[PDB]
Design a protein around this nucleic acid. Structure first.
Ligand code: MG
Ligand code: MG
Ligand code: MG
Ligand code: MG
Ligand code: MG
Ligand code: MG
Ligand code: MG
Ligand code: MG
Ligand code: MG
Ligand code: MG
Ligand code: MG
Ligand code: MG
Ligand code: MG
Ligand code: MG
Ligand code: MG
Ligand code: MG
Ligand code: MG
Ligand code: MG
Ligand code: MG
Ligand code: MG
Ligand code: MG
Ligand code: MG
Ligand code: MG
Ligand code: MG
Ligand code: MG
Ligand code: MG
Ligand code: MG
Ligand code: MG
Ligand code: MG
Ligand code: MG
Ligand code: MG
Ligand code: MG
Ligand code: MG
Ligand code: MG
Ligand code: MG
Ligand code: MG
Ligand code: MG
Ligand code: MG
Ligand code: MG
Ligand code: MG
Ligand code: MG
Ligand code: MG
Ligand code: MG
Ligand code: MG
Ligand code: MG
Ligand code: MG
Ligand code: MG
Ligand code: MG
Ligand code: MG
Ligand code: MG
Ligand code: MG
Ligand code: MG
Ligand code: MG
Ligand code: MG
Ligand code: MG
Ligand code: MG
Lengths: 46, 193, 162
RNA sequence: UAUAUUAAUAAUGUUAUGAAUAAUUAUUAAUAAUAAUAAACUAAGUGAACUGAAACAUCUAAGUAACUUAAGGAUAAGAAAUCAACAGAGAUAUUAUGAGUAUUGGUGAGAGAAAAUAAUAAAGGUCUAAUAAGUAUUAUGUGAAAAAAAUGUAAGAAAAUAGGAUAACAAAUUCUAAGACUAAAUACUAUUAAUAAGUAUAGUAAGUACCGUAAGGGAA
RNA sequence: UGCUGACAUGAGUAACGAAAAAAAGGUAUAAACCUUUUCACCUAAAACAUAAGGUUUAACUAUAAAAGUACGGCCCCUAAUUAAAUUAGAAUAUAAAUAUAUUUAAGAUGGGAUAAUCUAUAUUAAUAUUUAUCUUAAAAUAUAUAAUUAUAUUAUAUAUUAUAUAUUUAUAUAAUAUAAACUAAUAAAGAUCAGGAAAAUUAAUGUAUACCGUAAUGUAGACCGACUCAGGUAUGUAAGUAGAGAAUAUGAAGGUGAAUUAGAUAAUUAAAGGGAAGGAACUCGGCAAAGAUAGCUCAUAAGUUAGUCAAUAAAGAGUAAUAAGAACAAAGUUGUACAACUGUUUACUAAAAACACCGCACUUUGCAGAAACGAUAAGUUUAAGUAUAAGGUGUGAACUCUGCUCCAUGCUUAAUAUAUAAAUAAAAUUAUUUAACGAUAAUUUAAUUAAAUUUAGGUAAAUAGCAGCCUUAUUAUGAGGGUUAUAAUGUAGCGAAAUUCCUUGGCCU
RNA sequence: UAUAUAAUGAUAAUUCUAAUCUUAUACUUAAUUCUUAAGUAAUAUAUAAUAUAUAUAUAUAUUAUAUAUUAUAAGAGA
């Protein structure tokens, strides 16, 4: 069938997988946040 | 096999009971223990199971549960007793003679549902219900997958029958070398039958 | 090599090197020490210390004549060899040897005697005192007083009993 | 229940017939708390592949990139079991000559020192250790392209009447491993001053708008 | 086909994205906005009420109102699963990172008391997957004259009349009243595919009832698709008439009629209707189109694996239809090839003969196991299973059957047959050095010392293999026969095969 | 004849074990979830004595040294 609609929004999954805690509660996510801070990004995670 | 709602069974793993010991009627002196033992359903150690008895639910150790001969229609036979070595020789449904602890568990009689092997599932849905997903043959696969794969048309690729991970699937003894069975008198028929 | 923190490895770690073939092809390989689990009797602790050591360390125990001696050697080499665990075991052994060597007499009952008096005085003035804070206050007071009661004994923390 | 509680001046509405109150006491002493935690520099563990060799596997790239761990304003090194050669020097750390020389390599692509003489540098020499044993050494598998101290497995000494150093032996020299501290010259970063045959496309916005689910990319 | 920026040509061309609209008035302002009327369209939706999502897009800033009994969340409880958390010096393993097992905490898509005669949650006193609702019962009626069947009813849902009250609250109840669907609560009971986890009562006091969601959109212009995109998107109600039906026709209420309009309707293109005579003469091919003489009740053959499988058989009958006069369901037989069958596949050119399958064989593993995973280990799945179990391999239901061979590659079993690699307690001995002893670098021997290797079997439903040459019955032809090679020489069956080049092979229909 | 009694080794097999390995389950003084040092109430071990029959061994008051207020049970085993 047709393609293009790969993003199916759901706040629960959005926050659980790309939220701030989802990254601050691990080694790798903490590194992502730290790298984004160093680059100076305004928005670290959803 | 013969167990039906209504029958009475018992276990003598702990031993012969005081109820009979003090009563002296069924105690060892008249040796009613033989006929109290060799009756289907009850559980006894091999030490007090006579030779040649058909048994199931055999253990390995004096303190361990019944492990062998536990499926439907399965049984084993007591072939020998060695009190000095605290051991017994039992032949299992595989046809293998094996050492077992003489004070190991065993139940008299064959396991029920003898005809379980004559059943016939009629459709793939029945396997799916039971929890069996489809099996894909190696020859149908690609060479990156199972070694049998590849080849235009149906072809076995001159490859010795083997598993997807390169282990021969016809006659290749998998348990080989130093790590074999320490308690093993005689191997199973292995093509004799 | 965090496997070694749990045992007496004698300051020997893994070695990563190359495996050379006859064509002199190289392939990374690893050398492990010969770690063995063993229970050695300790006299000062009067019990078996069960740990993972190397055969070399075990042979050193055999030479030096005991796990106690091995742990309590003085050289900096040994201090380095004895890892975090060995260090703790050494502390236990030396503490036990010291407490066997010099016993306390070669005060708690008098603290108990003084406890109710202070408790009653605090109650009278409207305050309270429990055992924990009591011992905390009077932990480090060498000199006692006779403000109340009478000292009908001359133990004086010297030559107890006849 | 840190407006959280034994003690207190009196009590409403009641206390299985002078005290103890679910809305509480001007009060007084005792008892649990708060992770904003950068970068770069340094040390250590593991460590590629592209590539070069006009192919490729020894070799190279390279102990580099990357990941992981742990310190300090710096870290690391450091006062000879060192060099040297019969004459002598006298701790580390960078730089120039020595020198692309000795050395080394499918003796290919290629790699490559030390003595010694100068420059920068600080007061640069000191004791903290009962003077160092599964240690030196040996065999074996690895180990900075030349030059070598660590390293898995196992055998294993001596006391200055001794030990280390060289393919080996003799003679002679030189220094004392298995115990330690050490400014300065150095690296990174941030301020201040000076000079720019530097920048207005290396001249302040914005890591924003916007793109991707995300890591991430990224304007005028 | 350099990069960025500006501007051109195509060009005022193609397009303006399923669609019914018309007057009068607001307004001598209007195709596009608002109102009224007429007309249409969706109506088991284009309506109503919601979930998720989202630039609040809404009937808006003066804005979406909760103690709970149909209020959700919040909170208690847990599933799947997650966790720099958790465990005498020592939970286990591991180059680091980290990974295991156990605890604990978290985590719905789930469970959680009472309540319209309206209700009360807190503190102190003890520690039931899924599916179905009888042949037969009793009265009164239609019943026939003993039928027997024809049914509310062989079970529930409430309101009225009477027999009674404590100054009419709870009962004991005898009568009256249902046609077809559906609902939530019983009772009994059918197959095997055997059907979640978790948090315990009376008493005495007690309750001033916190926080958050609430608009509108939600088969969409208000979300995911680069667009106000004919795509994707979860629930319940979904008037009546008619029907077996949620099919099909209409449409009562409701909502709507669209960022394109007005003319004209050439060639030509798309979707659709009709067609004389003929009926596949088209084409690679009946591709496309056309063809239905009940939809209910009867009746329904040969084959067959006995299954109304074939079958929704074909043809046919009954029921008003006799010139016809809604939509929808229903689209004929037969031979062959392949595949037992239902199913799966190349999201976006292949749906099949390919995959799967139930069935059939071989093989490994005795459980401290085979198999897979684990910079590698602990450990995990296998399995809380045990040779009728689990893994691997080929074949692919069933009938009739499955012939010959271990040469080769492997597997497998024994041969007192047989190389060597590493590892040492000694010295029959050369070289170097040294005045010297001595210090450094070897070859033979030991009671010693593997797997492999090659010998001999077994193993083909293991991987695999299954030949040539020449005359006799005075003939094409060759029952017998003669010869070389081999492990053996293609058996039963089938045959110009989806296998046959020659090849439009010869013959029949 | 016309190479092992002995001394040793090789091979095969069986046995034992604190090599190794796998499964399961009250007080007294002294420095109020603690420790230590001396003695205890009861739960358990060896050899000497009670008293039994054959001419190598039973069952018990009480005492001699080391401990609990890792261990047991089972299995494999040089
Ligand atoms: Mg997209
Ligand atoms: Mg996820
Ligand atoms: Mg299963
Ligand atoms: Mg199958
Ligand atoms: Mg298959
Ligand atoms: Mg294929
Ligand atoms: Mg492969
Ligand atoms: Mg194939
Ligand atoms: Mg490094
Ligand atoms: Mg190259
Ligand atoms: Mg190439
Ligand atoms: Mg330093
Ligand atoms: Mg280099
Ligand atoms: Mg020294
Ligand atoms: Mg020295
Ligand atoms: Mg060496
Ligand atoms: Mg290199
Ligand atoms: Mg020194
Ligand atoms: Mg986007
Ligand atoms: Mg044009
Ligand atoms: Mg035109
Ligand atoms: Mg146009
Ligand atoms: Mg107008
Ligand atoms: Mg419809
Ligand atoms: Mg309707
Ligand atoms: Mg709506
Ligand atoms: Mg609520
Ligand atoms: Mg919870
Ligand atoms: Mg929920
Ligand atoms: Mg809403
Ligand atoms: Mg609403
Ligand atoms: Mg698109
Ligand atoms: Mg749309
Ligand atoms: Mg309709
Ligand atoms: Mg209408
Ligand atoms: Mg609407
Ligand atoms: Mg439109
Ligand atoms: Mg037109
Ligand atoms: Mg016509
Ligand atoms: Mg006609
Ligand atoms: Mg034709
Ligand atoms: Mg034609
Ligand atoms: Mg057609
Ligand atoms: Mg007929
Ligand atoms: Mg028939
Ligand atoms: Mg149709
Ligand atoms: Mg098929
Ligand atoms: Mg199909
Ligand atoms: Mg396709
Ligand atoms: Mg199909
Ligand atoms: Mg395995
Ligand atoms: Mg099987
Ligand atoms: Mg097949
Ligand atoms: Mg078949
Ligand atoms: Mg065959
Ligand atoms: Mg050798």
């Amino acid at each position: 069938k047709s393609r293009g609609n790969t993003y199916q929004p759901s706040t629960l999954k959005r926050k659980r997988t790309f939220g701030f805690l989802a990254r601050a509660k691990s080694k790798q996510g903490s590194k992502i946040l730290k790298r984004r801070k160093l680059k100076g990004r305004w928005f670290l995670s959803h | 096999d013969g167990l039906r709602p209504g029958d009475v069974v018992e276990s003598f793993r702990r031993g012969i009971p005081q109820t009979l010991l003090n009563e002296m009627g069924g105690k060892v002196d008249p040796a009613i223990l033989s006929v109290k033992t060799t009756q289907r359903g009850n559980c006894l150690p091999i030490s007090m199971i006579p030779i040649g008895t058909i048994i199931h639910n055999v253990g390995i150790t004096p303190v361990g549960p019944g492990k062998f001969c536990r499926s439907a229609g399965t049984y084993a036979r007591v072939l020998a007793k060695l009190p000095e070595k605290k051991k017994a020789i039992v032949r299992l449904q595989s046809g293998e003679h094996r050492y077992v602890s003489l004070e190991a568990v065993a139940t008299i009689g064959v396991v029920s549902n003898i005809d379980h092997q004559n059943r016939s599932l009629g459709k793939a849905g029945r396997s799916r219900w039971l929890g069996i997903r489809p099996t894909v043959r190696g020859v149908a696969m690609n060479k990156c997958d199972h070694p049998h794969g590849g080849g235009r048309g149906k072809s076995k690729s001159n490859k010795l029958s083997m598993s997807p991970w390169g282990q021969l699937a016809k006659g290749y003894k998998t348990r080989r070398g130093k790590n074999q069975n320490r308690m093993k008198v005689k191997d199973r028929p292995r093509g004799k039958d | 090599f965090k496997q070694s923190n749990k045992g007496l490895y004698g300051g020997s770690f893994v070695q990563f090197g190359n495996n050379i073939s006859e064509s002199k092809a190289k392939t990374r390989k690893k050398w492990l020490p010969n770690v063995v689990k063993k229970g050695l009797w300790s006299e000062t602790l009067n019990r078996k210390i069960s740990i993972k050591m190397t055969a070399k360390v075990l042979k050193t125990i055999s030479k030096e004549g005991g796990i106690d001696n091995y742990l309590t050697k003085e050289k900096s080499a040994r201090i380095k060899e004895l890892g975090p665990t060995g260090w703790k075991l050494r502390y236990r052994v030396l503490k036990r040897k010291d407490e066997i060597e010099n016993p306390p007499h070669k005060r708690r009952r008098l603290m108990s005697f003084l406890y109710p008096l202070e408790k009653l005085e605090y109650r009278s003035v409207g305050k309270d005192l429990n055992y924990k804070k009591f011992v905390e206050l009077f932990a480090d007071v060498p000199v006692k007083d006779i403000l109340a009661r009478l000292e009908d004994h001359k133990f004086d923390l010297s030559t107890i009993t006849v």
